[PDB]
Design a protein around this ligand. Structure first.
Ligand SMILES: CN(C)C(=O)[C@@H](NC(=O)c1cnccc1-c1ccc(C(F)(F)F)cc1)c1cccc(C(F)(F)F)c1
Lengths: 120, 123
């Protein structure tokens, strides 16, 4: 038994990270702007153990993984850790969707998708 | 934004507005599902508030919850309390006395002996 968070009330708390799903279809840029307005970022995947709840996520949703032409990187500038995501090519694009279990789909940044914000 | 602590909950359970949830994909009939939650200081999902449990809009598939029909004809939770109105739309699927949760805020009537996935909730 432990106290989780802190997180805002309308967010799921899991191992002290906070997650919120947004059902609005938005492109990657608009989804990142949405998360920032909540004092958050798009989903960052850093650990299969600390984030094992991501195995239960259904459907595909924007996360904060982008390609600047260099490897894939998160919004915060950190590199994607190895052996964490299986990356699959889906569309011509520089952004990625999260899909269970621990997959990233390369996706056109302009394609509207639902999205997951994260705070910690 | 206002930061709150959530819980307390076991570390491997989801916390949402201080309730803790766990999903179980190993299928069990209703009673065995209840026994499994009990062994984890929990009960099957109890639905009491659209606002406090709005995360249930996102819970798909069909999972046992702790809702049973007593043939005084009442609908009750495992803890003995009543199903409150304006919370769930209840639909028959199989003749039975137990209910599966489905999105959004639906319950499907199901034979209590049918194996299904289930949701535990700390209580
Ligand atoms: C039985 N079951 C496992 C479901 O139905 C799952 N539903 C969806 O993932 C789900 C289904 N439609 C739309 C969105 C989601 C979704 C997306 C992101 C998250 C977030 F913000 F968490 F990232 C949460 C849900 C599920 C339901 C509740 C909680 C969780 C969990 F938090 F554990 F991931 C998963």
């Amino acid at each position: 038994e432990s106290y989780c968070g802190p997180c805002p009330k309308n967010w799921i708390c899991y191992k002290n990270n906070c997650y919120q799903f947004f059902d609005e279809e938005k492109n990657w840029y608009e989804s990142q702007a949405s998360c920032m307005s909540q004092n958050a970022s798009l989903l960052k995947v850093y650990s299969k153990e600390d984030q094992d709840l991501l195995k239960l996520v259904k459907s595909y949703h924007w996360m904060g993984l982008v390609h600047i032409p260099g490897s894939w990187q998160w919004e915060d500038g950190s590199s994607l850790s190895p052996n964490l995501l299986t990356i699959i090519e889906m569309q011509k694009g520089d952004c990625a969707l999260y899909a269970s279990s621990f997959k990233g789909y390369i996706e056109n940044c302009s394609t509207p998708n639902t999205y997951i914000c994260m705070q910690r």
